[PDB]
Amino acid sequence: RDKIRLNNAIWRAWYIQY
Amino acid sequence: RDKIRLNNAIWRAWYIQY
Amino acid sequence: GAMGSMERASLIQKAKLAEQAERYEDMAAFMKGAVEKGEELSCEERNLLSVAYKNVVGGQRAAWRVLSSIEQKSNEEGSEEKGPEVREYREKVETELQGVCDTVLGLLDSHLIKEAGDAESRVFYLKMKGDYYRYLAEVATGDDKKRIIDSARSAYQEAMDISKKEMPPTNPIRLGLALNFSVFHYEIANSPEEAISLAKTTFDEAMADLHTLSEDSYKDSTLIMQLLRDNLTLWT
Amino acid sequence: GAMGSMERASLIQKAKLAEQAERYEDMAAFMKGAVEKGEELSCEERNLLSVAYKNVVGGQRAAWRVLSSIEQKSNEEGSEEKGPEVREYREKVETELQGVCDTVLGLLDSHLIKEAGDAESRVFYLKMKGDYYRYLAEVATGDDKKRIIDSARSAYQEAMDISKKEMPPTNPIRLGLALNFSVFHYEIANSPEEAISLAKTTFDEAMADLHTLSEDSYKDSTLIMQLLRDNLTLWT
Ligand SMILES: O=C(COc1ccccc1P(=O)(O)O)NCC(F)(F)c1ccccc1
Ligand SMILES: O=C(COc1ccccc1P(=O)(O)O)NCC(F)(F)c1ccccc1
């Protein structure tokens, strides 16, 4: 679960950053 | 370095196991 | 159809093997083969189709993001431009990505969606249609973008309408649909408030339905609820 | 040669981009293109060639290991055999792996090794020859195995002979060669004592030469020394 959530957060954060 | 060493150990250990 | 000579059951078995071996291109090709046999897919088979293509397109999107990030660094006076190479290679990846999205959309249109009568299957495929249009939208520009965005919206919306009528608020497919439609609103349609509203509403309504679930279903539903909450935290 | 129309410098630049995007199939194809331009490779370019193909073959080997592991579980009375599928798919991966190894060996033979006069380059390519024969050996059986093993040995040995004569004991290429030849002895040639002896000798002689190095070179040499020590710990 933690890895899935971490993975999701990275993808979603990329949009916000860029 | 740690990840490289860990990666290496996994590959080499696979041969010993199998 | 190179998979045309292989048994449906063999294609499915090899898709599972490819999954275990993390060979997602192979897995996708096997499941494409299975779809092209013309029969409806079971729940398990639908998951295999989704996992395979999600992983393939995921890889291409990640690569595209790296290259896009590099491209826009080089395009300025701050850093010496490197020539046409980064743009060319970014476009190659983009074209391959578009090819995979077009392949998936082709499968859904021929004829998975048409033949999906059950809510579980129909919502699953319409969600997928929305997803692959969303991935196309991420790399599109201008007027072509607007039509792609509308196609994604229309697929998601139809899926939403059925899921509200035919599925409980905790149904993982309904939840995953709402999560992805919410991401569409935020990242594609420039509607952050719609994204947040949808994620919050979805979370609250699922929360109030958790009491109906066994521990197995509870674990699956709370997983997606957590992604909804994670996204809300990021967006608010 | 689909890369035949693209500039050597562009192929190199795109190989670096593919590396950053973790697109190792692309990276390998670009470097193959660059090799086929006919010019010698620089140190940096040699590294790109190696990284690309090592990553491609690494993926195939990992998949092969998964499938082999599954295949041998199903082949017994303890577990219902699944039919020809696992064997067929394992063989498909094996054939692709053999294709990549054959491609690399083709490049080294046409004409990287022939044209490599400097110890640094020649040892690098001969090590690679040994490696890709070693990967072929991992999936070979019977008499075909024995000839492949001898080809790997001969390449490694020639590399060793030059490296001892032309390179200091801490040279990363010399060290990486010894590490891989040691792995060959242990995993391929059924010579664990030769593997251990070589790893220990290599480690001790590198240790006594560390004092000559700057901090940059020290870091590179100690990395491989650590892999040598890790392997020794595992084998003893
Ligand atoms: O982790 C991510 C990051 O994004 C992607 C990453 C790769 C492909 C597509 C997407 P996208 O969400 O953009 O379609 N998404 C959530 C999930 F992995 F899909 C997921 C997991 C578990 C339950 C439900 C959903
Ligand atoms: O980590 C591994 C595990 O094995 C592989 C994994 C993938 C491909 C090939 C091999 P193989 O060693 O079998 O050629 N090997 C050591 C190293 F990654 F190559 C290495 C790293 C840093 C310095 C020197 C060497």
TrEMBL record, chains A, B:
Sections of the chain in a coiled coil: none
Subcellular location per the Swiss-Prot or TrEMBL entry: Nucleus
Descriptive protein name: MLX interacting protein like
Organism of this sequence: Homo sapiens (Human)
Phylogenetic classification of the source organism: Eukaryota, Metazoa, Chordata, Craniata, Vertebrata
